[PDB]
Amino acid sequence: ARPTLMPRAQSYKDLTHLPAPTGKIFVSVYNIQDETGQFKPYPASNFSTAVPQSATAMLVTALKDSRWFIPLERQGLQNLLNERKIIRAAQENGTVAINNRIPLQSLTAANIMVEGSIIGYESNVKSGGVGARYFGIGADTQYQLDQIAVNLRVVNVSTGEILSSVNTSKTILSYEVQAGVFRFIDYQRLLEGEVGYTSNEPVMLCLMSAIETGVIFLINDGIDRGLWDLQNKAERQNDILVKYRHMSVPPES
Amino acid sequence: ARPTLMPRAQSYKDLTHLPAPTGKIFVSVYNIQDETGQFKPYPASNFSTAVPQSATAMLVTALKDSRWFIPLERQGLQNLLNERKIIRAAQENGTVAINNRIPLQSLTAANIMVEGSIIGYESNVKSGGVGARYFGIGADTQYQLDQIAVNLRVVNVSTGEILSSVNTSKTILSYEVQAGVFRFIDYQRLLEGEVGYTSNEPVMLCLMSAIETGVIFLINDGIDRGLWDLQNKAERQNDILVKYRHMSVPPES
């Protein structure tokens, strides 16, 4: 096979066509920890986590494609401050190269900072399967679905209050379809066959689509509570926004 | 499947329609530790905790939707102080960008601070099952229920006393329904089938509903002991409040 872009769900096509704001919001994403505490069971290793530890770099991508935010790199801040120290110590001397002759400006800092966690991971919420065999020939199916949940909250950096906070969920579906034959065809001959197929939804990909959903819930809530303005009041009734505004009532169980 | 909001129990629909106060209370939630000490048994990994480590971000959401509290982010306080240092060091120089030109105000600090823990997790409190098979054809059920408990206590930050403290509980139900056929239909043919289904309640979701219950016990107790006032004395007899006031007598065993 050949590499390509990371595949996207319906939420990324939903996130990209958001209506335009008046201006973008500078935002810092420091750390999104794996607060699930869940590791993978047997036959996987005892050390492998169930959820990938890269939820920080997934949100910064999702904020960037949204055309609403300008993220500032604070995860590699310790490496970014070390590169500017190499410039600034050379700027005092005359030993600057042809690049970086001009004095650098200070770090751009943000007005908000969204942070959050992955709030729990639950494996095998539902399971089932139907198998049936007549004489020699039959088939069976199975399925298991897991569940993930992501918290995201927007913090005002001036005061320190939390402006809005949402929890989005996603179900990771895994199934398996198999069929087999073990039968005596005409005397002292044994016909035998087996065809199977499984499919696991990647939790790397369901985590990306649960974060992309949570950004649209953050952006649409800001238009409601007056945190930020759209470019036109007539596009309050946008058909992407009313899809995520009639989902604000949570499901019941 | 497609992502959506995190599903909610009856307690969140119970929490949202609380009667209105006169004013909101600033509150800081620092840390809610997993004080159960319990990890998942076999066949799960030896390192995976039974309760998720994200009870801090669950309470701050539950306080926010309650329309009674304005939470202040103290979990990401070390990242919030680092962003303001990037502003304040640039504010002395003339190297501020177009944003953050105005001087920032200090951190808003709270009058109370609710903290607590998850006080123990007990697996397999009750178990059972009924199975029965006649000639070739039968079925069986099973169930296991676990138990969780969450402590929450409100601390006055001025003196240091503990104003009120409640313990809420929740039972995590898991069951399994299965039926199977293994029978000789007409000579030298073997009919055979199997249909099963399990269901585990997510402990990620039962922890969220045990915290949402504990906030209503905290809010209703404050109206009783005169910690804070409702907007109207006539809404003391609200039908949501009297549901959680006639539950104040604990069950017996």
Binding site: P21, G23, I25, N111, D229 | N99
Partner: peptide
């Protein structure tokens, strides 16, 4: 609000 610069 939060300030928008764009």
């Amino acid at each position: 609000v939060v300030p928008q610069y764009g």
